Structure 1
Amino acid sequence: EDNFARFVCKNNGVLFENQLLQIGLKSEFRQNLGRMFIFYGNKTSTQFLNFTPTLICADDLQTNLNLQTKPVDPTVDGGAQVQQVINIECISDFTEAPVLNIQFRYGGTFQNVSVKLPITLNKFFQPTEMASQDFFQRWKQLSNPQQEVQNIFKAKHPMDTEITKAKIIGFGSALLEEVDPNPANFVGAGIIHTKTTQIGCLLRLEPNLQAQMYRLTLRTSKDTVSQRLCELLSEQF
């Protein structure tokens, strides 16, 4: 399998490695766009032939996310690496992830890998710094109850405050300081950018030190965006 979950809050690293091939990633996002560099490393001493990487999207996913790539070099020498550049365009908010399928010939045999690519909605965030009075005026403007999504869950990791802070920044929103009157809480704000619509997002993360649990709350201008962002961010703490 792959390292998908490690890429919600970070962009660079090893996505997958078997005993023949290592797949590395480097990505950068801006506005509703991104560019992902995929690195294919041959760990063996023999060249791969008919090297064919294919990006597969559910058809519902294709209406929301446009991926473009140019053909990759089809021969990968042993001990070498080849690069693929994926240009991304977010059309509308989405939950599904694309699947990278890699097919190649090695030592006379057919090799087939499939792994989930880490393109998730939070990658299209613009951080938005704001003052306490601003944050609360916007938080108290929600009207539709499905635009608020709450999750109370057990902590997977120790409540180490600086690590928590750095995860919130890697997720993509701004981390607002001394906005919540409770100093143990964490507050964030940003905008999710898409071709068709720009979605305003607020978040609140409340630790319970005795129970080693958290309550996360998302308030956004779109129900599905509140839902996807809450499920993604809940898995980080």
Structure 2
Amino acid sequence: FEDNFARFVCKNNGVLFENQLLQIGLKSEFRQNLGRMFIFYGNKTSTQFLNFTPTLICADDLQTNLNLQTKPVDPTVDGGAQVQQVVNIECISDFTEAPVLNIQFRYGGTFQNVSVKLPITLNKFFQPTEMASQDFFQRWKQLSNPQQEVQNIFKAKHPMDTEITKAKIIGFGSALLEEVDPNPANFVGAGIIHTKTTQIGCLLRLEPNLQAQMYRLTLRTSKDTVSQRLCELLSEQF
């Protein structure tokens, strides 16, 4: 099997899970604190699936932070057919955990049971905000409380590739701000995390070291837990 949850930080669409029997494809869209996720259950076999009952599971804290609404789907999935489920998503507040999609079905007399995390991460509610450099620096200096900054220094997992790095920052949900850092090698981003009761301004600086293949990533936001979660999600992409 293939489980691709961790490959959805900076993209919205693709195969989430695939094994010999079943493909779970996914498309998703987000705006402000809301999203919609289309789940596509593909029957790769010649036998229908039966009592197919997808269950969304949200761990302890997560249910108060993240609201998911869906309809019942086909109990029966004909062989070679593809069936759609739509999930409506609302971010009530920031969160770390991901919802779990659990899939149980009968198949030719055999009991099938699959679980995979849905790619609903905090940065799906992250929208880009362009701004001039003096505005950026006023905002950065406004976030001067030590709790607001989370910094990570880490070895690159991927090539030190400028154009790919730019696309990652953009696919993450940040604006990419040019000519703000007077070092043209560095990357600066800005956006807003949308929740039900607040917008959280988020600023970031990514500093490559080409010769050492290292990065320093810094994220400043008005909420410690947002700075932390955004930094750990974004650090993992480079």
What stretches of structure 1 of length at least 5 have no aligned partner?
none
1:212 & 1:60 partners in 2: Cα distance?
A: 37
SS at match of 2:234: helix
**If the length of structure 1 is used for normalisation, what is the TM-score?**
0.99
The 2-side partners of 1:196 and 1:50 are apart by 39
Q: How far is 1:144 from its partner?
A: 2.1
- DSSP-derived class of the 1:114 partner: strand
Gaps of 5+ in 2: none
Counterparts of 1:31 and 1:210, CA distance in 2 = 39
Aligned length: 237
Shift of 1:214: 0.1
Q: Measure the CA separation in 2 of the matches of 1:28 and 1:195.
A: 17
Cα offset for 1:78? Answer: 0.5
Distance 1:188 1:12 in 2: 23
RMSD: 0.7
C-alpha distance in 1 between matches for 2:121 and 2:173: 11
Q: What is the rounded CA distance, in whole Å, between the counterparts of 1:182 and 1:224 in structure 2?
A: 29
* Structure 1 position 59, deviation (Å): 2.6
After TM superposition, give the deviation of residue 108 of structure 1 in Å. 0.6
The Cα of 1:153 is off from its aligned counterpart by: 0.3
- The residue number in structure 2 matching 1:222 is 223
- Counterpart of 1:6? 7
Give how far 1:209 is off: 1.1
1:99 shift after superposition:
0.4
Distance in 2 (CA, whole Å) between partners of 1:167 and 1:88 is 23
Q: Does 1:141 align with 2:142?
A: yes
Summarize deviations over 1:46-103 as a string: whole Å, max 9, x none: 0000000000001310000000000011100010100000000000000000000000
Q: 1:126: Cα distance to partner?
A: 1.7
1:133-163 Cα distance to aligned partner (Å, 9 max, x none): 0000110112321210000000111111111
The alignment-based identity, stated in percent, is 100
Give me the whole-angstrom Cα distance separating, in 2, the residues matched to 1:43 and 1:61.
Answer: 33
Structure 2 CA distance for aligned equivalents of residues 53 and 5 of structure 1:
21
TM-score, normalised to structure 2's length?
A: 0.98
Q: Distance in 1 between matches of 2:107 and 2:127?
A: 43
2-structure distance, mates of 1:158, 1:7: 19
